[PDB]
Design a protein around this ligand. Structure first.
Ligand SMILES: [Zn+2]
Ligand SMILES: [Zn+2]
Ligand SMILES: [Zn+2]
Lengths: 69, 49, 310, 45, 49, 42, 56
């Protein structure tokens, strides 16, 4: 629902590359493969972590908080 | 060491089914009995037989 | 008096009375918590039908119905045989009255607790020497009113008269007799503290329903509830009927909140005379400060000048 | 006595035993128990 | 991994592979059987219960 | 004659509620089922 | 058989009543007193027998 911290297979930290992955797609107009290779994800185990991730936390954040401070 | 046979390798979509072992492991040495037949009850949630 | 036939689970080694006894339900044992000795093993943790021996008594009856292969001739004779029984005539009429209780409550969309309370109130007040000459509809109406009052959900006399066609005098006398015999049965049986459930006024419980009949918002309803609560302090209107107090509080808070509902519409909806509502508003205009919620006018949602003068 | 939060308006309320379970601000009859004040420990595995 | 078994990576499991949330909701109501036979949501004590 | 007593709305209400709560369709079983919410495709 | 099954014993004139172990009274929440179906049938048999006795 949010980007995993580490790649499942090898353990490379991919959780810090998610926000820069979206920038490479929306304002640099790169295709997904070049955006993955630019971030340093050269193993397809790491590439499937970012490429196949679904950001379901954005849908969860549209609901109003139950306990609002 | 290298394996003599090369391995088919790659990503595949896998689904986690709702059958866990922890929801299915069951044992009973002695427990409650039925009111009618006085035999062990049915169901692991009731410590059954 | 009578045979004992009582089993006590006491540890024969600790000899402590009362014993610390653990019922290990998962292992099916009854053990002593001090030494661990088991007392009774193979304990019992569907197949029949639920039957509470408090609403319909200890009556066990089964009806005859059509099966997979059933002739029509045999069913009718058995139904007539079951109907022609003389020993359950009292049971038959009390079940008929319970069916009428369910029919009247279901025609009012009353909750199930009202049905249960009315049924047990009818059962407790049934077959009373002091209650023999009253009409069945009066018993019906008073049982429904008692069931409404007991569940903190009380309706008014006009509601029950709107459903059940009963004269006011006989309904009031029936209610008084059933309240007396209910207090007598409570004293004879389990004593129940009233804690304002048989209250005559109960004007806090009429405000939300009467506001719903007018389609008012919530804050008007709570302002009317506060106004009706503070109307008890006013000695000039303390003798008024709680319907009239609730209606004049609702109308005062309608004028306070600028809700476009006239006095004629309030009088038509809740069957209160428009002159009565106008007189209640006139007599409550002098006490505007106490009736209106101070935090509402502090937050500025309403102001006291919105109320028209007399 | 015990703290609750209304389900839709998210207003903190204090309810006793005799109080009917109902929001005092927006009137929603669904109330959530407040999260406990004691600190709860989680293994990070 | 014989006869439909599979070998999962434990290190992958440690990083969240197929880790799931499980929610279970318990419903309970206090029902009024009659006048004195009513249920109450309370913390029971061993002295009087 | 009271119209509130003439029309028992509980007949319609309880009939629809019973035939939708249970699978029974009458007075055919399994017509109404609890909706599966294991996955979205389910 | 002369000793174990006579045809005259095929007609029921003294109905045996099974003990409550045969027909236990279940509890739905340990406050209801729901009885077995055999208890209900025996109650109906007793009601019919009393009705026939009173009619005769
Ligand atoms: Zn990797
Ligand atoms: Zn002991
Ligand atoms: Zn609220």
């Amino acid at each position: 629902m949010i980007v995993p911290v580490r790649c499942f297979s090898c353990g490379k930290v991919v959780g810090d590359k998610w926000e820069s992955y979206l920038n490479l797609l929306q304002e640099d107009e790169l295709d997904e493969g070049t955006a993955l290779s630019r971030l340093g994800l050269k193993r397809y185990c790491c590439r499937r972590m970012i490429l196949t991730h679904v950001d379901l936390i954005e849908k969860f954040l549209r609901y109003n908080p139950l306990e609002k401070r | 060491k290298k394996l003599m046979a090369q391995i088919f390798f790659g990503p595949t979509y896998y689904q986690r089914l709702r059958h866990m072992v922890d929801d299915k492991i069951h044992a009973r040495a002695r427990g409650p009995m039925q009111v009618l037949t006085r035999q062990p009850v049915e169901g692991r949630s009731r410590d059954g037989g | 008096r009578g045979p004992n036939l009582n089993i006590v689970l006491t540890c024969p080694e600790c000899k402590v009375y009362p014993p610390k006894i653990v019922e290990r339900f998962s292992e099916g044992d009854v053990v002593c918590a001090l030494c661990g000795l088991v007392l009774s093993d193979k304990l019992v943790d569907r197949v029949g039908e639920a039957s509470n021996p408090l609403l319909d008594g200890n009556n066990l009856s089964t009806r005859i119905g059509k099966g997979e292969t059933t002739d029509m001739r045999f069913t009718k004779e058995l139904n007539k045989a079951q109907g022609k029984n003389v020993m359950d005539k009292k049971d038959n009429e009390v079940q008929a009255a319970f069916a009428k209780i369910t029919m009247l409550c279901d025609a009012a969309e009353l909750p199930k607790i009202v049905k249960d309370c009315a049924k047990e109130a009818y059962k407790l007040c049934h077959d009373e020497k002091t209650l023999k000459g009253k009409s069945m509809e009066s018993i019906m109406a008073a049982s429904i009113l008692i069931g409404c009052r007991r569940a903190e959900v009380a309706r008014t006399f006009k509601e029950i008269q709107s459903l059940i066609h009963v004269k006011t005098k006989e309904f009031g006398k029936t209610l008084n007799i059933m309240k007396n015999i209910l207090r007598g049965k409570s004293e004879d049986g389990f004593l129940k503290i009233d804690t304002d459930n048989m209250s005559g006024a109960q004007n806090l419980t009429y405000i939300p329903r009467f506001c719903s009949h007018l389609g008012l918002p919530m804050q008007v309803t709570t302002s009317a509830e506060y106004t009706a609560k503070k109307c008890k302090e006013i000695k000039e209107i303390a003798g008024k009927s709680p319907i009239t107090i609730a209606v004049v509080s609702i109308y005062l808070n309608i004028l306070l909140f600028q809700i476009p509902i006239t006095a004629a519409k309030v009088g038509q909806t809740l069957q209160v005379t428009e002159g009565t509502i106008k007189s209640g508003y006139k007599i409550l205009y002098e006490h505007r400060d106490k009736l209106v919620d101070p935090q509402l006018i502090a937050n500025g949602v309403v102001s006291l000048d919105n109320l028209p003068g007399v | 006595t015990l703290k609750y939060i209304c389900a839709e308006c998210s207003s903190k309320l204090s309810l006793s035993r005799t109080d009917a379970v109902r929001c005092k601000d927006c009137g929603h009859r669904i109330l959530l128990k407040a999260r406990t004040k004691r600190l709860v420990q989680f293994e990070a595995r | 991994n014989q006869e439909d078994s599979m070998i999962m990576n434990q290190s992958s499991i440690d990083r969240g592979l197929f880790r799931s949330l499980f929610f279970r909701s318990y419903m309970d109501q206090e029902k009024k059987y009659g006048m004195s036979i009513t249920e109450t949501f309370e913390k029971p004590q061993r002295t009087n219960t | 004659f009271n119209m509130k007593l003439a029309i028992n709305a509980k007949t319609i209400t309880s009939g629809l509620k019973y035939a939708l709560a249970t699978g029974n369709w009458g007075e055919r079983a399994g017509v109404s089922q609890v909706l599966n919410r294991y996955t979205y495709s389910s | 058989n002369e000793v174990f099954s006579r045809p005259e014993w095929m007609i029921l004139t003294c109905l045996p009543v099974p003990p409550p172990p045969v027909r236990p009274s279940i509890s739905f929440n340990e406050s209801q007193r729901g009885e077995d179906d055999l208890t209900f049938k025996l109650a109906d048999i007793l009601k019919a027998n009393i009705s026939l006795e009173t009619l005769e």
